Structure 1
Amino acid sequence: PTVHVEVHQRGSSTAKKEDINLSVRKLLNRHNIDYTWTEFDEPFLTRNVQSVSIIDDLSACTVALHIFQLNEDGPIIAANHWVLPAAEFHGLWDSLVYDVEVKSHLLDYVMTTLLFSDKNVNSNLITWNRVVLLHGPPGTGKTSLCKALAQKLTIRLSSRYRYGQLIEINSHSKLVTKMFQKIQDLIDDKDALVFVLIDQVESLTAARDAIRVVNAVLTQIDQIKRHSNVVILTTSNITEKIDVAFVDRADIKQYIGPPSAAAIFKIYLSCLEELMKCQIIYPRQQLLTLRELEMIGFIENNVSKLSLLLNDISRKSEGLSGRVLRKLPFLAHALYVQAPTVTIEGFLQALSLAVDKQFEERKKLAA
């Protein structure tokens, strides 16, 4: 089909994008074989290009290049405002691990909505709108996915929108008008794709003159969703429960749930890789993926012993949220390692102790 290649232009670069386009294509001619490049023999590439990563063999495919430059300025009262591609969100997307390739659908759904918006596809004949709801138990990183989806969408849609904006509204809170007029001021630039994010929308319905401010925010949402370049992002923790009125509002609803032992193992692998990269886990060892274990039928030998053990830690980590899971190597290292350097076996033993102590606290909440 179409092969997608992401080019991370350096912040200090001053090159025309047309020129960064021609250099990367020359590089693809040589290797011609999902791999990421960080170093280049070309002086032009060394100067202007941080990394060129290919995202899902033969040369002759219809290859699309997305060249982007991160916006370092971080992170409008009272709201968080970022310019996309933002430097805070770099790599956020690849970090999020989900069972059913949720991210792919989500991207594809929102990508298609924008295409129907752009072609003025009639809502009454084919169902689409500009609201996306992500619902599910807490701790699945729903807000990180909205941020990650918005950065991806900005990078991928570079030929239609020159930059992206993300405005994050905190659920906890005239003043609203002052805030939506600035948002409208950003939306008035048709060279941008404006994302508005409302975290824990259900909190408005749950906590309810404060009835009037909640309703005023809905009319303001209603006014901004009217625009070609607006996309709205909501998240709710009461997945099972019906909600007012983001349910009716959102044509794209996606359920996010706790990670399986298959994902936990993908997550942990990414963590240990990081410690090995940083040399906190030393010396570096090979770890096996779940497919690799399956192909050796889980035999235990020097090659696989430690990967099997990590597997078993992933299975006993089930029922923990993804938020807990990425914090665990911190506590593992702080609580049990207590030293600048560890062998990978030493770290796995810290990680398991870590996992045991987590469930001990759970049972304390139950009792």
Structure 2
Amino acid sequence: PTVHVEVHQRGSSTAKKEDINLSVRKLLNRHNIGDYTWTEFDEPFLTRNVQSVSIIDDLSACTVALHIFQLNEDGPSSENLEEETENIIAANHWVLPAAEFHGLWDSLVYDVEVKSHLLDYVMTTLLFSDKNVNSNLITWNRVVLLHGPPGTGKTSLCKALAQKLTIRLSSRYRYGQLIEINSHSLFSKWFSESGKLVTKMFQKIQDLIDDKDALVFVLIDQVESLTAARNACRAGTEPSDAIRVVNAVLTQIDQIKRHSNVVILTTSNITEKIDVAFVDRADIKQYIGPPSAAAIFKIYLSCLEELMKCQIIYPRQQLLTLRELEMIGFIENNVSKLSLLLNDISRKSEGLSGRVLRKLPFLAHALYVQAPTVTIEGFLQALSLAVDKQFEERKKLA
């Protein structure tokens, strides 16, 4: 009965772990009765010290493992290039849980638990890892290769994964770090120095690696920038540069293998020219596709909810995930027809990108709402016309 639990610790509070532990357990045990978002408090302690306590995948007697995270505040931690070229953004160094990415885990929807797969990846990782398994016999690479066509959330998923792993591993990591590998930065003008300082970068990595209190999160967006090609024409024109620095990056992955705390996140909207080196160092190798119908549905629901919370649609209303829609047998009544036409919106919406999707509601509120206030029953067909436009647009896009 594993039930992981979130505890948002303020950067403005003063409470500590035991106080908050007792307090939150008292809150639950007071209620102790799907998933809920405990945000309206009765106890003054957490009212002053905690901003959000929710759980995301009806009963009580499950292993309620609380987990306390303090969403920090700093966004950038400038670590410029060691060599030269002042004010060149070498490292974007992201403190752990800091609120940039709060609640962003609710982005994706791929109900095959692809998320959960990637999630408990690192959990099982550390389980095997620090329980005396022989590397020499069984070993992996703490690369993680998300994989899928663009407009899907790959980099976003990387980030959210890091955040959630954070909230989980408080028991074993008081904190950790994310590392925005500015790939295009990594190279150098010169003949050699490029690889030479690839080392330096991975050394800044090793810095964090030493911190057993922390947990390392390499984030190499668009690794092809690192690894151009072993398969081009002989005119590569920077071969002794390109391929060289590439296999250097290979060496660095291969050294960082042996540790037990690092994880490398890697994606490509552009898998075409991926260089066999990574794919053969063969992380989870998680393929992704565009969102599913039900996915579009859930995401539209979330959109509507954020909207009604910011009053942009004034008469706040009720929604129904496909669960209750399917239980009511899709009976055509006034209440249902809202979400039923919504489902139709989705069923014609599939074939598009979640990026464009979460673009839709707002940009439609611009396009066909044409009013500072609007309600559902026209907002919906409005979104419909918007999506029709989107398809005809990609068509005309030639």
Calculate the TM-score normalised by the size of structure 2: 0.86
Q: CA deviation at 1:273?
A: 1.2
**Separation of aligned partners in 2, 1:357 and 1:57:** 42
**CA distance in structure 2 between the aligned counterparts of 1:328 and 1:171, rounded to whole angstroms:** 31
Q: Percent identity?
A: 100
Q: Would you say the 8 A contact 2:227–2:274 is kept in 1?
A: no
CA contact (8 A) 1:7 1:68 kept: yes
Q: Is the 8 A contact 2:4 2:65 kept in 1?
A: yes
Query: Does residue 2 in structure 1 map to residue 2 in structure 2?
Result: yes
Q: Cα offset for 1:118? A: 1.7
Separation of aligned partners in 2, 1:57 and 1:270: 21
Distance 1:205 1:40 in 2: 51
Q: RMSD of aligned C-alpha atoms?
A: 2.2
Conservation of the 8 A alpha-carbon contact between 2:101 and 2:160: yes
CA separation of 1:331 and 1:56: change in aligned 2, threshold 3 A: closer
Provide TM-score, normalisation by structure 1. 0.93
Partner secondary structure for residue 158 of structure 1: helix
CA drift at 1:168 = 1.7
| 1:326-351 deviation per Cα after TM superposition (whole angstroms, max 9, x unaligned) | 11112111111132221012221221
**Which shows bigger deviation, 142-151 or 231-240?**
231-240
**Structure 1 residues 240, 345: closer, same or farther in 2, change over 3 A?**
same
Relative to 1, partners in 2 of residues 1:243 and 1:282: Cα closer, same or farther, differing over 3 Å? same
1:44-99 deviation line (CA, Å, top 9, x unaligned): 11111112213444443322110010111013942322111121111111222123
Q: What is the deviation of 1:25?
A: 0.8
| TM-aligned CA deviation for residue 166 of structure 1 | 0.6
Q: CA deviation at 1:241?
A: 8.1
Query: Are residues 309 and 57 of structure 1, via their aligned partners in 2, closer, same or farther at CA, if it must alter by over 3 Å?
Result: closer
Which residue matches 1:260? 292
Structure-1 separation of matches of 2:227 and 2:44: 57
Secondary structure of 1:252's aligned partner:
coil
| Shift in alpha-carbon separation, 1:308–1:105, aligned structure 2, 3 A | same
Match of 1:186 in 2: 208
Give the Å deviation of 1:13: 1.3
Q: Is the CA contact 1:123–1:129 (under 8 Å) kept in the aligned structure 2? A: no
Report how many aligned residue pairs link the two structures.
365
Give SS of 1:303's match: helix
Does the C-alpha gap of structure 1 residues 178 and 242 become closer, same or farther in structure 2, counting only changes over 3 Å?
closer
What per-residue deviation string (whole Å, max 9, x for no partner) do you get for residues 240-260 of structure 1? Answer: 887421122234221111111
CA shift at 1:272, angstroms? Answer: 1.0
Change in CA separation of 1:189 and 1:70 when aligned onto 2, cut-off 3 Å: same
**Residues 250-289 of structure 1 mapped to structure 2, 5 A cutoff:** 250-289=282-321
Shift of 1:287: 2.1
Aligned-partner Cα distance in 2 for 1:54–1:291: 19
CA contact (8 A) 2:228 2:246 kept: no
Q: Report which stretch shifted further, 89-98 or 124-133.
A: 124-133
Structure 1: which 5+ residue stretches go unaligned? none
Deviation, 1:32, is 0.6
1:205, distance to aligned residue in structure 2 (A):
4.2
The 5-angstrom pairing of residues 97-108 of structure 1 reads 97-108=109-120
- Give how far 1:235 is off: 1.1
1:205 correspondence with 2:227? yes
Contact 1:127 1:251 in 2 (8 A): no
* 3-state SS of 2:69 partner: strand
Offset of residue 227 of structure 1: 2.0
* Equivalent residues of 1:264, 1:317 under 8 A apart: yes
How far apart, CA to CA, are the structure 2 residues paired with 1:239 and 1:179?
Answer: 24
Q: 139-148 or 179-188: which moved more?
A: 179-188
Per-residue deviation at 1:140? 1.1
1:29 positional shift: 1.2
Q: Distance in 2 between matches of 1:82 and 1:138?
A: 24
**Greater alpha carbon shift after TM alignment, 53-62 vs 79-88:** 53-62
Q: 1:180 to 1:123 in 2, by over 3 A?
A: closer
Q: Deviations over 1:12-56 (max 9, x none)?
A: 112221211111111111101111211222111111111221344
Q: Is the 8 A contact 2:228 2:243 kept in 1?
A: no
Deviation at 1:155, TM superposition (A): 1.1
Query: 1:280 touches 1:341 (CA, 8 Å); kept in 2?
Result: yes
Q: Given the superposition, is the C-alpha separation of residues 20 and 232 from structure 1 closer, same or farther in structure 2, using an over 3 Å criterion?
A: same
Does the CA contact (< 8 Å) of 1:116 and 1:128 recur in 2?
no
**Aligned partners of 1:269, 1:123: CA distance in 2, in Å?**
45
Shift of the 121–143 alpha-carbon distance from structure 1 to 2, 3 Å rule, reads same
Give the drift of 1:185. 1.7
- Measure, in 2, the Cα distance between the counterparts of 1:239 and 1:298: 41
1:263-287: CA deviation from partner (whole Å, max 9, x where unpaired): 1111111111111111101211222
Q: CA deviation at 1:106?
A: 0.9
Contact 1:113/1:128 (<8 A) preserved? no
Displacement of 1:288 after TM fit?
2.3
- Greater strand proportion: 1
Question: In 2 relative to 1, CA 319–171 (structure 1 residues): closer, same or farther, beyond 3 Å?
Answer: farther
CA distance 1:240–1:100, change in 2 (3 Å): farther
Residues of 2 paired with 1:99 and 1:45: CA distance?
A: 33
Does the 8 Å contact 1:32/1:57 carry over to 2? no
Q: Note if contact 1:97-1:263 (Cα within 8 Å) is conserved in structure 2.
A: yes
